[PDB]
Amino acid sequence: MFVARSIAADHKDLIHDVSFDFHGRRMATCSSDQSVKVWDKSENGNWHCTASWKTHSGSVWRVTWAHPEFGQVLASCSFDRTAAVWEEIVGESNDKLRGQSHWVKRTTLVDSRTSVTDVKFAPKHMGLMLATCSADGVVRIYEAPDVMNLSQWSLQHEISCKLSCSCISWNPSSSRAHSPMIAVGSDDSSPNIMGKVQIYEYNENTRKYAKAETLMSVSDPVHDIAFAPNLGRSFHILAVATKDVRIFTMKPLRKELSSSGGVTKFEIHTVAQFDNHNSQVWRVSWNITGTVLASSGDDGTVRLWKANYMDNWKCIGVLKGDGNPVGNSYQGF
Amino acid sequence: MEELDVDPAETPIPGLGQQNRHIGFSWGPGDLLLYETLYQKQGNSETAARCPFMYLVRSDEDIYSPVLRKLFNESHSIFVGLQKSAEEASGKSRKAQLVQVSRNYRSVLRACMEEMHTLSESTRETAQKYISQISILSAMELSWNLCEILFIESAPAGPLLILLLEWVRLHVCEVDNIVQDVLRSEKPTEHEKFWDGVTGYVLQGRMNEARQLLAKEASTSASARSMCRVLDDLLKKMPMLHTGGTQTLTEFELKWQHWREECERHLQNGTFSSNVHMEAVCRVLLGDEEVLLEKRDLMTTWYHFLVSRLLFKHPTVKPTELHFYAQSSLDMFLAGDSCPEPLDNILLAAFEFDIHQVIKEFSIVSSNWWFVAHLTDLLDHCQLFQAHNLYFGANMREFLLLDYASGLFSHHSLWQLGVDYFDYCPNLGREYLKLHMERIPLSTEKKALKALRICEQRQMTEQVRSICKTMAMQSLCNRRLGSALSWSIRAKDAAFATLISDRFLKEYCERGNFTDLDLIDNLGSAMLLSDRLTFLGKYREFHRMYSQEQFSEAASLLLSLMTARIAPCSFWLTLLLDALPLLEQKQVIFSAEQTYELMRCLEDRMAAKLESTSPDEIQKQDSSIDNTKVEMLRLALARNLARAIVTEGALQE
Amino acid sequence: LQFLRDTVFLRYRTRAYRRAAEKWEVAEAVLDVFYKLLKDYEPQPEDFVDQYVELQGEERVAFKPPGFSLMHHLLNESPMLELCLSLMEEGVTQLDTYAPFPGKKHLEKAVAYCFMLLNLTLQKENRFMDLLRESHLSMIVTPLEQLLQGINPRSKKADNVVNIARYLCHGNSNAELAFESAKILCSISCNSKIQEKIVGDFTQDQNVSQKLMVGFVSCLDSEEAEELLDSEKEAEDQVKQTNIRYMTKIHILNLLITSLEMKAPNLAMFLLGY
Amino acid sequence: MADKFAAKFVSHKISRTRWRPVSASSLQQPDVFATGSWDNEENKVCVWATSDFGATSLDEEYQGDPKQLCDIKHPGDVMDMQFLDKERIVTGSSTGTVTIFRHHENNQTLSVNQRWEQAHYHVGSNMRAPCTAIVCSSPEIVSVGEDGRINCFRAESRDVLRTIDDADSSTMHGVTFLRTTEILTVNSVGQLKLWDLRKQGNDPTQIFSVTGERVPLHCVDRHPNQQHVVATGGQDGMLCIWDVRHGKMPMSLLNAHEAEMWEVHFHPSNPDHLFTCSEDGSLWHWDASADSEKPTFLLGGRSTFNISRSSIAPPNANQSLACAWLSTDPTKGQLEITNLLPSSTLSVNSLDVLGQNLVCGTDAEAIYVTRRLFS
């Protein structure tokens, strides 16, 4: 129950994202003001402008934090053809003394000459990589070898993803018998083109990503793409955001015996499809347990969808930023 | 919940109803993190005013009410007692303990009730939500009694009527209020609530004190004295198990019918034809439903309506016809004034057994999966049940377990019970535990370590080692190499162990000396993993075999270490620099040929060093000094080896 | 004061000893001191008057007489009571060890200080209560007979009197020890309502009463008969101990007369065998 | 048997033992540990090292050894000494002085950093007083004392940051965290008192005593299976267990003894076993349940008179069993405390348990340790 103000932070420009600590208490706002503002939820909760330093050129669309086992490290993207990397390093030995802090650009990936449409770190189980995508249809894949050796970045891999890259997604993987995959939603406009979302796997014997799939069905510029958190989930689900809402279930029906890789046999169902937002749906945000999805669009509303004991899906929340949402709701059959 | 897809439970934002703007989001742990963001804006124009307010939408608003902690914790306590018992006991005993725990839980909720009062009579503003929660918790008491009595013992009629009358007297508190008012104002027979209390007594089956007031009435009126005496005889004959438990129901029904027929006899005699109250009592005693429907207003309790129906007409019961009686009672009560109501239909579905739809009614009325979770544990213990079970079409247990633990994580210590209940859904629970752990801020040695304990008794070393290395490297992030060290000894990681060993060796490059040496010297056979630390410790060993001049075993250790062929060359420099005076000393164990694979490797390493880098990149008077000193050192090596060979030969004589 | 009581009198028992004899002489060195304290401290009515004294209108703490305090501590539960108890049980135990030991001597001396100290405790507690009754100061005291029937928290039973009696059997050459035991017994007997408990104590067991009668026979068969009281070879010791058990039977008979001054039960019928 | 002890005749009296911390969370025994003197040669703080665990340590006497490292001497006894962080040390002085070191493990020295020379004191006599309990959650520091003041400090200051004084204060026995910034004590009146770090005033923040034989409660601690439920021990011999963060209520009133509980402390590897130390002349290991039908740590130890290790288990077919916890009515029975005396021991004034490992220093002029608390 917090009433909403239109009052905003001192950012004189559009605020792009806010990123929160993967261990808590810490947040940061990225905007078109070009200054990155690190706020820290105090013990009283009062978050104040604890840091603010310039990081890029152009509209800094996205800031992504990494777990401190990555180091207290962050990636950021903007209209600079490149991707900046900052870890916050402090002086002195933290026993009961707190010295002076300082923002560190470990690197900035020039990413050829292409604007970084999305960028984020790599998952735990696959080593420590990071992925960048651009409107070039090209995805660069950079590498840091050792734990103290952070600043250095070498393009370990690149995946050419046909149409211009817009929104990317890592597949959660925690089994040696499982593989890492990537889903790619394209915001290029072509009603002709089906499968505007492209899916790649790491075939380990080939040591390489192949195209796993496309969504031969999709001809709508994808706003964002979001795997459902699936690690105990014995298959996968995908949330796809455009003018509508696409939800797909991908179950391994045949895993091959001597021909695995390239493509593996999955059933895909359009287990949900909704226009309930009645407008273009920008983003879908998962709960970390992989059980909840939030959805927002131009109307400044968020609809909140879950699975039941038939795993089917309902909106369990409808939240208005253009108005005042109603109270509780429950139902059965 | 159990039903996991419902009509969107929207959370009101009173803001942006007049002052709108587009919304941005990030997920909280059990809360929801909303703020204003500038894209596809609902409102108008930019804003830059340094606004520090937050939007914390809480499906966990329950955490902010003070009593819920006691609620759920002591529920936890009794509950864990229940399960740690569930592996034991049998049949009759099991049933007994079921009833016991039932009474225990009700008493706990009762305690909540009285303290809840203590809060409410104090409060003048929050009293209203206290009223709401007292209402709901009373509903759970009444429903809980109903379910237990209906099911747990599965007793036959007789004791059933006894326990239901006990139920009604427990849950009805008006009669004692009328008692207090009657004793408060004038004489009981002069009290306006005299006959009101008398009717309450007739309803409650407390004919002893009912006859006590009948004595007051008969003393007051010389015309109704015989009327009171006849009624007293009726109350003497009325059923209190006309025949005992070793008898047959036939005899009890005989006595019931004798009492019945004499009551109709006295009625039709016109014996009760001059006292309105007592003749209405005669209709009641004959179970005449017109008086019951008239008193419906003083009743307010159509379950009391039905229990009166059953007692005054149906001393024997049948479960199938219980639904029939409930239907009749409900229709007759709605006849006075029909209005919408959940609880009536809920307790219906109770009598027609459908526990699951009863739960559904509860879950649409409310949002507390707690009470249902304990319902579930009971049903789990009940050794098989079926009312269209949704555990064969769903998993109510783990559903409520995870809802419950998720609510528990909301507080920085109250997650702990969530741990204790992932103790019974671990195939996702322990992993969600690590998941929420890494996500939440943490420092605490003991709670973290205990989570570790929990894990290893379950033999789950993988997440274990992950977290150990993670928090160790945070330790060193705070510049604490010591905690990193011990914790790598905890993770058993030769890699990072060798790394920080090499940090130690660079410290020796800086200072030329050892610190906290015994802290590693004590490590024993565990040294076999980190080879860099193994080398550093063996250097300590040789260093002190020098310091007490232990020539033989010093040289033997050094030989073994170099045959092991480990560590960078720039340090084997100082290694043999210190080996010098031993080589000087007259010793026969000197194996010159082994010394010379030492020196040929030295040549190899110095060649490699020169190829990889220049020995001196600094131009100073002392750089050439250091160089020519190195050549002199190897020249000394040659000459001393020559002397050692001479001595060895002169001793081979 | 606090030093000696805590650091020593609480801690003397807590020590390690290569030879057992040390404990005896340590305990004597502490008991005798407490005895001079008791013996010297003579109470007064003004001992109850004021604790804060207005040094220039400033009520300052001025701690009560050390006597005052030590009594009142004894007058309520004191570890002194407990260690006195202990002393008594090890006294009985060593006496049960009729094989001679280097330190039995220090034992009779120590327990003797026990007897006589407690005697003075009795002779002063009366007057102490007396002064207390008029006092407006709120002090708490429990009369000691209640202690004598208190549940001993090692045996969970009120064998205070039984432990007292155990030394009558041992006084086969200890007319003194019998004397102090019995005189304390009658000094307690100076009041009423105990014969019942005494009878229960006697009636625990047949063998208990058998060892009891063995002890009483030991006490009584020599009231002028030791075959040495007329011998000048042993000289003054025999005649002095004759004096001693003379006074013992004196106070025995005093106690018996007092017991019969009360209604049934009266332990004299018991003791006569009835 | 239960993993017999290593006894090292240190020829020294012990008062305070406290693990050298590395914070965060790990399982090892801190090999390094700082020791406050009962009376070793003077009152001092020494640095000592223990060859952790039966692994890589079964030597240097029999089953390991702690070793003296250095020491620095201290006015006023070390009644209590807790560590702010990895190497910042805070001890109370009987001189009423709060003393903070930074240790130098490599230099084997202690640095005399910060002193609050001023502490709890007696009025009407102008005399100094030691501190009853120090509270260290880095870096906030709390001090509580006999006279009843409250001493609230941020780390690193030689002047009082705050001392809450009251028109109502008393003697304080034992303190524990209820939450991160919530605190409880047991008192010498039979008094259970509560405070929040942020909100205080005049007279105690919260005061409790109820039926159940209120006795001066000496020791309190928060359970090794949960903190907001805590246990207290006092004169009567009955252990009182409570659930709070703003309101008290009894889990149990266990008739676990007949006499004062001087100090109680909690088993890590067993969140449901306990230990008690008492200068009544004894020291007990406390165990769940009672009876010798389970391994007896009620009469275990004492050199002779040993009993333990009995067991029987129903298969749950036609067999039923019930125990005390399954009753919620108060006033439960004894719960298995065993006093142990190897050949002779004096007042054990400091003890520590980590996992099933135990160390303890004493007035018996030696140290006693075990790898395992059971068998």
Numbering used by the authors:
A (entry chain C): 1 to 333
B (entry chain A): 1 to 653
C (entry chain S): 733 to 1006
D (entry chain B): 1 to 375
Task: Tell me, in the authors' exact words, what the paper reports.
In both CR and NR, named the outer rings, the backbones in each subunit are formed by one or two Y-shaped complexes, also known as the Nup84 complex in fungi or the Nup107-160 complex in vertebrates. Here, we determined the 8 Å resolution cryo-electron microscopic (cryo-EM) structure of the outer rings containing nuclear ring (NR) and cytoplasmic ring (CR) from the Xenopus laevis NPC, with local resolutions reaching 4.9 Å.
However, in this study, according to the high-resolution and isotropic cryo-EM map of the X. laevis NR, we found only one copy of the ELYS density situated on the convex side of the inner Nup160 in each NR asymmetric unit. The AlphaFold2 predicted model of the ELYS NTD is fitted well into our cryo-EM map of NR. It is obvious that ELYS has extensive and tight interactions in both the β-propeller domain and α-solenoid domain with the inner Nup160 (β-propeller domain and α7-α34), suggesting that during the ELYS-mediated NPC assembly process, Nup160 could be easily recruited by ELYS. Therefore, it can be concluded that the question mark-shaped density represents Nup205 not Nup188 in the NR subunit of X. laevis NPCs.
